[PDB]
Amino acid sequence: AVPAPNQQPEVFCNQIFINNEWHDAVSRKTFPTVNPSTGEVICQVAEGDKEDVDKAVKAARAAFQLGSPWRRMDASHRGRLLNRLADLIERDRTYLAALETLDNGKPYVISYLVDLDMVLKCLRYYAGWADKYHGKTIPIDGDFFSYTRHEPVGVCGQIIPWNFPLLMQAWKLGPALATGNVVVMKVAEQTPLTALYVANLIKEAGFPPGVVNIVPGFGPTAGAAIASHEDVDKVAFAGSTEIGRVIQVAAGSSNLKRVTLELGGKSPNIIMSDADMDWAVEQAHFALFFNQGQCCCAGSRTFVQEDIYDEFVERSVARAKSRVVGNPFDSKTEQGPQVDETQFKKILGYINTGKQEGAKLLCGGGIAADRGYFIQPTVFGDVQDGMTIAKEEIFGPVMQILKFKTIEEVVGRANNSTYGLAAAVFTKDLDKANYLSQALQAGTVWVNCYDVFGAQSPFGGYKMSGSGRELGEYGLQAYTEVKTVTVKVPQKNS
Amino acid sequence: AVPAPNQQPEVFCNQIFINNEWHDAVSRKTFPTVNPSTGEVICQVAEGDKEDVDKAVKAARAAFQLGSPWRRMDASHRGRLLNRLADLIERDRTYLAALETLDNGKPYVISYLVDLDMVLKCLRYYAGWADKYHGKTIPIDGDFFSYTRHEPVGVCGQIIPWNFPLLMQAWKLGPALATGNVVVMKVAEQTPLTALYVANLIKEAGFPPGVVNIVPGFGPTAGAAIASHEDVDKVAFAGSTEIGRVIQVAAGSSNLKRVTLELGGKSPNIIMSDADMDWAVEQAHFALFFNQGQCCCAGSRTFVQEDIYDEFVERSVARAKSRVVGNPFDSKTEQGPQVDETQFKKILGYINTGKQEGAKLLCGGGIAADRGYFIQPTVFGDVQDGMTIAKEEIFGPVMQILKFKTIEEVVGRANNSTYGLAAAVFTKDLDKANYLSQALQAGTVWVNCYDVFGAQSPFGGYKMSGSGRELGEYGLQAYTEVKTVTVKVPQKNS
Amino acid sequence: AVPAPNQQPEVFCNQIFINNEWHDAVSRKTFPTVNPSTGEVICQVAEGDKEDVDKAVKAARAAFQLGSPWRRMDASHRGRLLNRLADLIERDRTYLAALETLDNGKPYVISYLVDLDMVLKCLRYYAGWADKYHGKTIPIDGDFFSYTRHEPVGVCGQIIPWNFPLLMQAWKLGPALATGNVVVMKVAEQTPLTALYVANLIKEAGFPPGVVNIVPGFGPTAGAAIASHEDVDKVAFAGSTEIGRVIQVAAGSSNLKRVTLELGGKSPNIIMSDADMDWAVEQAHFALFFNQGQCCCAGSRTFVQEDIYDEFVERSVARAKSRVVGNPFDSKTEQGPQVDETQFKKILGYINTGKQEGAKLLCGGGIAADRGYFIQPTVFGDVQDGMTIAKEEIFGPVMQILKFKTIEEVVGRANNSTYGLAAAVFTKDLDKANYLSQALQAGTVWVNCYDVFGAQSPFGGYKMSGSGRELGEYGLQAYTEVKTVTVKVPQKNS
Amino acid sequence: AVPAPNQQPEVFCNQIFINNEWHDAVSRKTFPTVNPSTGEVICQVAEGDKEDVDKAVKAARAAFQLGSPWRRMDASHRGRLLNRLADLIERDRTYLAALETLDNGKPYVISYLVDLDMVLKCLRYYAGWADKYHGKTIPIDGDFFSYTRHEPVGVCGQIIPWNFPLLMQAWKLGPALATGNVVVMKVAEQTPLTALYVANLIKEAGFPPGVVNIVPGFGPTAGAAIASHEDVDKVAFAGSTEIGRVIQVAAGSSNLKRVTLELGGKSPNIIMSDADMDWAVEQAHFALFFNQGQCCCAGSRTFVQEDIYDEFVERSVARAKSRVVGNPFDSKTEQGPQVDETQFKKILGYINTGKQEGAKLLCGGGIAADRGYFIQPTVFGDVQDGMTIAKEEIFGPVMQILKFKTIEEVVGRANNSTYGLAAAVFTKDLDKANYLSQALQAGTVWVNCYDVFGAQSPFGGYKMSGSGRELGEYGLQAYTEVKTVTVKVPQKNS
Numbered sequence A, B, C, D: 001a002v003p004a005p006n007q008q009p010e011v012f013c014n015q016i017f018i019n020n021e022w023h024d025a026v027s028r029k030t031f032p033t034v035n036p037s038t039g040e041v042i043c044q045v046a047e048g049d050k051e052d053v054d055k056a057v058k059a060a061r062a063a064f065q066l067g068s069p070w071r072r073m074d075a076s077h078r079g080r081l082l083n084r085l086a087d088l089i090e091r092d093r094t095y096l097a098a099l100e101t102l103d104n105g106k107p108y109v110i111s112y113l114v115d116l117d118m119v120l121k122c123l124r125y126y127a128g129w130a131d132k133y134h135g136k137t138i139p140i141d142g143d144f145f146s147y148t149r150h151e152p153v154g155v156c157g158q159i160i161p162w163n164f165p166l167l168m169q170a171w172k173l174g175p176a177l178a179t180g181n182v183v184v185m186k187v188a189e190q191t192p193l194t195a196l197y198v199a200n201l202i203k204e205a206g207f208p209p210g211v212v213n214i215v216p217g218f219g220p221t222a223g224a225a226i227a228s229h230e231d232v233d234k235v236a237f238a239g240s241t242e243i244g245r246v247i248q249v250a251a252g253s254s255n256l257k258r259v260t261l262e263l264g265g266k267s268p269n270i271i272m273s274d275a276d277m278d279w280a281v282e283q284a285h286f287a288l289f290f291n292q293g294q295c296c297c298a299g300s301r302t303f304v305q306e307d308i309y310d311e312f313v314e315r316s317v318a319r320a321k322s323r324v325v326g327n328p329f330d331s332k333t334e335q336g337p338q339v340d341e342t343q344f345k346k347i348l349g350y351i352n353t354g355k356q357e358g359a360k361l362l363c364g365g366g367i368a369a370d371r372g373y374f375i376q377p378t379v380f381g382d383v384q385d386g387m388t389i390a391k392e393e394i395f396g397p398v399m400q401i402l403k404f405k406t407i408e409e410v411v412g413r414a415n416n417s418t419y420g421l422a423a424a425v426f427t428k429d430l431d432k433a434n435y436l437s438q439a440l441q442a443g444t445v446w447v448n449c450y451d452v453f454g455a456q457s458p459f460g461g462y463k464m465s466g467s468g469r470e471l472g473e474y475g476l477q478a479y480t481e482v483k484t485v486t487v488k489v490p491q492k493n494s
């Protein structure tokens, strides 16, 4: 079951979080955060800029000083702290799920059973890594003892997007805190609220002051301030390929801070003629329409073998036509609103371009409600690789179906992209699955499934979909600085 | 192509190898080694017993002393020595393959292209591990620096069988020497010669005296002296399950030396009705008949789905009938003799049991030549799980074909065995492959192949097929002793 | 602060635990467990034997069947369950610490602050391993995809001693349950009660029935029935070297089950002349007298460099004379009774032995109280290597002080033992530390400290102190069975 | 023993190496490479620019195509090819060592015994890694089989400096080729010759055409063309911190290619009062003067405790005065010329700033010969933290000796730098070694030694000394792209 939501949850946190305290922006400015189901302002949030980020970095640097409580703390105790935080998130699960829906738009049942579940699982996974990420002892030549310490990278800037506000926070904080780093986090202007409440929980869980600092605000102000900061050791950025470029340039123009990026995708979902038809249809629908189409790794290029194309397309249309768009607090709602007006307008722009460039509009294609940012589930057929809707990330409920003949052809077409975040293969055949999974140029390849995330398995892009990995053991590599200690000994023996 | 063999290679090495020198046994007794193709004596070999083993162990212990050339040698240099040994074995490849064939009976072409190749690949793989098996630095609670050293286990007793004389030597020496151990090796009385010649090469490569010592002799004498020795730190045994028991009791009854065992099997090879028929028949032939049927992981229970049974059986009988038995130096020969008279008679015993118990004799079933230990390729059909030939390891050219209906049926019947060394699955279906590889209780599961060994991938038994793993990184564990060092420090920081 | 103890805690659990239920022995037999502070019977406990062990093994086998709740359970959820068990143990901490003291004799302040603390830390550490012990994907030669699965070893027999009842239970359950095994545990007849209570918490935590089964009873009966069982896949034993031999023999003579052993020690604690004297005296006292001397890694050979010998002895003797023996429920008490009458007598025998062979009695040497099993802290000076009290594990409050001159000498003397569990070095010198830590043949070497255990750092013996390691990542190896799956693929590419 | 050098070694390779063939630049332009001992031109070398870079990248890309010989080659065979290359460099060691000296300036004895030895060790180290860098099998939640593939990152741009021409090439090629990548290398204009000859050996070794491509030319042209190239997946740059910035900006401005950097340093060498005086003085001299002072991790800030300061400086001055500068082909020469006239002039410039700002010139200070770029071993005493010679990397034979009082003081001073490449500590004290190696913010900390490089131990910068690590297992991380494959399975079991 799912507990009944409070459909108008009280907001408690709306300021800058530095040193476990709440601060107005130095400018005293605030910006509104909007409910995308109604288009109405939820509340004002402090508008952090460069000066606020400066305060935050100083607090973070102080917390990181040798001999500080956070630096001296046992690695196992960092685990306990992460597990305490997860316990508190779970305590406030019903509230956070409802707030998540209020600010973002996603169905409450999904906030509750999916987003909040994944958040708990991620934080508890990483709690487990805290005292387990060993350095090495190394059999170097000569009369020496040589070993590596895995140290924290230090002051980590973390700039996150609005599509999974709580989950992306957890994906960042989990590996960073498990490895003893300190954080300055810039949350998305569209969805700052849940992350700020979680900051209260960080304080309650007992993290020392300055270990996690949150600065809500805009990208070119607060975000750029972090990426170009002289005393941020590392930046992790999740967002558009376009702003990823800005981040890497900022890093290089400033202090040569370490950089990881999780960017867009145009992920191919490949349906072989021997696929389980009903399963493949349902999963392709999910792969595209999940979270209002607002997923980095959305199955936005649906390649279907010619022999099953017609039936696949028929079945896909029926499912898109029966997908329930409405109030995200109604249990029956499958699809909420898009996150804001800019997104709403951009997706509608893409549907227009799709119609214009000769893609066959099979269903939807319009606005779904007269208030809030609701869009009809849209399916385009006979899509061609050169079409704008086949190339550009739409980030909306707009499905592309493309026809192919051969396994060799579809590999070339799938790989023909500057993106490489994810892909999938639907087939009953062992050799087809292995052929395709090895040939596909993508960070994750799903076989007879889609959007299967696990805290244990790494995720991240090939090509311009980003670099570095999040989740799994791999997710600790960007948060570790490696020191070699080589010691002269009287006589080295095996 | 394969170089022409010397069909009567000269024997240079036939004594006990200790401190890089050749010794008569202390009793001065010798035993004959026989050419299995003719039944004739090749030469006499020193008959090592307890006294000779005692000498060998003292030499190994001295070589292992803290501050010795072997203990002080750079880990990378152990790699250099292993690679040098591989180069010398390559230099003498034509000679060694022909000697292997003389003493063991396997086809010279197989000795050359298979055994010798796998030996080189194994030594060269482990050469690469020598300086790469790191200890750990560990984030323990409190003000401490904690780390582990991976030290050699020490003096390693290695008792090996006759079925792959050179490969079994390499499988044992590669990981032992990569990790800085010293060795007292007991070779099989049936096949002592190639391993003794390799000892000459170990000396030539530059290994310090005492690092590898070799005692040819019998099992209850030299073998048991090693297993029961008060100064041997570790024993690795490969052989029968019966002697495995003897070895583990000897270790328990002596100094609690560490034990690993590679023992027999009765490995199931499962052919689903969707398998590629031509491929499955050829691979099932190989799986069973490879090396005169003298393979620990022989596919000696061939389970075939009922819809393909008659055709599979027909094809299998034709393949067995075409199999050329003859002089192992003749390039046309596919099957040499069995290793000795004891094995010869045991295998004929098993065939007579097969017939008497109601299995269907479809081809072979008798002696194949009037000289040497040759047995016709023998196929039994309509084999039942309760039959002797379905349960006991035959270790000869005797194939069992069993009929089944369902996947759940075959899983349980395959698993209903006290052995679990290997298994194989032939199918085109992804889900059947995955279901079976998970469900099968065996150390290696091959999918659409058989007898695929890589130096990179571990190999070893479940259940009574033994314990521990050889090959890959895993092959190093049994040869490492772990030391934790925990050091008080002024102030631990992350 | 330590919560006031219930000095007469109620006993709730005194039966055989199988399938989450409490059972009498088939025989209906019960055995008294005694309070060592008073020599009085606490209560009677069900006396399990072969037939009860047979039921417990059948239940574990059932819980391990493919498709069972325990086998299908997400690894992450095994972590949640271990975490929940740690929470319940912490909830009942005050009760469990008092019950431990009642049955074992150790001071309540130590049960509470040390034993219980270490139990919680072990379980929480292994909770974190549950979903992180990865197998490997392997770049084998040829057109294959090769990988390994790390599967559970299966039905694990675990036989534990009486010196750290709750801790030894946790050391065994932690890694077995994290890796998905099932357990039949035989607890010590001297100290059954606390482990049985924890069984109640295993049920309360939500572990499926048959995952943990506990059989109280005696060694030659219940313990030997586990070791010889034909369906137990792995046995883990902690206790005497003497019984260790029996276990390895029983394993070899039965089904060749996998064995690990945690046995005795006679661990050298080396004090160099440049050591911090006050520290080294206090730590040498703790190293020996901790837990009534009943510790496998007790520093039972204290080697002191000659220039500081006289002062070190003077100070050690004053320290032993000041050690408070009495009621373990009194907060003033440093030392409680020995565990039982047998150990009491064995220690008195060793004390008389030291006097007979000429070691200098500096203090203690007698019975400390009328009731229970209390022995005076005893220090022997001028101990020589050849003496029985210098060679054999005493397991009581009996300290040996040996004098040495050189670092090279002391290495040789420290290593001249068939034991090799632990060692320590006290020195301010970098090179002396590194020289000694390298040269000492011991599973753990402490430097300027003693008895510093971390859940993160492995622990186990060299030589006749045992084999295999407990704690850390290494603790998982003995609980994992490795399966290679090697799959033919159309065309292997890097 | 060292073979007599050819002091005018012949030049065979001076063109652009693409597809295992030699090419003139598209422009037909050449640049002189100069002998720094004489100031005379050795020969002309093809001047590569963007058009030649483009030809090379297309070559690398083709060689990387799925199904090409290099992609399909067994990982173990990649290892064999690396070992073959090492064998060829060893065969040609005398020639290559003389060529290195001729083009670079370093003493022939050093080229031969140090650089060449290190090149061989690096390549043979990485040969061993080729088939051992496993991906993982991951116990993800749900009915899934999840695993990682460690794939090559792809086309690798490698831009290397002039100070260790052959070694830097090896450091780059070793890990890149072990993991199946393809390379476009830009060698330093000052030292192109040796790396070009090694390209001949790469062809001879049997590496498929296009796997390694080498473009000599200038930085703003050929190097920038590599960094900005839209089909280069990864760039690795070694050189100045200034140009490191340019690289990172170029990567984010183009295709968001993966970046690792090895930049400058101003490494502190800390001499505690309890240090071994003779050894510390010799090591501090080596630490600064190695390779004409042309070492990224040079001990260019020598901190000396005040109690030993006077003696230490006195001895350091005597040692620098006795250092032999001259013809690098003469066996008596310890120091050759600096690499070129720019470096020559820059160093004299720093010597002038040292005099101007009031540092105590103790010896040297000027040119050491009328021909070639020879500079006197120069020592400054009483150096202060604010001085230019204490802050900026000089990259010449100019030693800075600074005085300190306390361990706490020197930590702060050592860490007060935007560099963090290496540091060293000289002390006999265990606690001081541990305290310092932990507190020092440097990629490598040497204790009682300096410039101890091992192929096994990673090396790289903290802060603006760069990012990522080379050597050891860590050196493979930047050359790997991680793919997750997650497969729906019928029913997941442990």
Ligand SMILES: Nc1ncnc2c1ncn2[C@@H]1O[C@H](COP(=O)(O)OP(=O)(O)O)[C@@H](O)[C@H]1O
Residues within 6 Å of the ligand: A159, A160, A161, A162, A186, A187, A188, A189, A217, A218, A219, A220, A222, A223, A224, A227, A238, A239, A240, A241, A243, A244, A246, A247
């Ligand atoms: N110039 C910038 N520098 C740093 N961060 C930015 C910049 N612009 C936007 N951001 C931030 O990056 C995150 C990802 O959003 P963004 O890439 O702008 O996606 P979109 O523009 O499609 O909404 C957000 O938190 C946003 O505030």
Ligand SMILES: Nc1ncnc2c1ncn2[C@@H]1O[C@H](COP(=O)(O)OP(=O)(O)O)[C@@H](O)[C@H]1O
Residues within 6 Å of the ligand: C159, C160, C161, C162, C186, C187, C188, C189, C217, C218, C219, C220, C221, C222, C223, C224, C225, C227, C238, C239, C240, C241, C243, C244, C246, C247
């Ligand atoms: N023959 C045996 N087989 C199996 N377990 C035994 C045997 N004898 C004793 N045990 C058990 O092993 C554990 C350790 O005991 P042991 O090594 O005998 O120490 P002690 O005799 O000094 O108490 C206890 O649980 C004990 O009951």
Ligand code: NA
Residues within 6 Å of the ligand: A033, A034, A035, A036, A102, A103, A104, A190, A191, A339
């Ligand atoms: Na919003």
Ligand code: NA
Residues within 6 Å of the ligand: B033, B034, B035, B036, B102, B103, B104, B189, B190, B191, B339
């Ligand atoms: Na023979």
Ligand code: NA
Residues within 6 Å of the ligand: C033, C034, C035, C036, C102, C103, C104, C190, C191
């Ligand atoms: Na008791």
Ligand code: NA
Residues within 6 Å of the ligand: D033, D034, D035, D036, D102, D103, D104, D190, D191, D339
């Ligand atoms: Na030059």
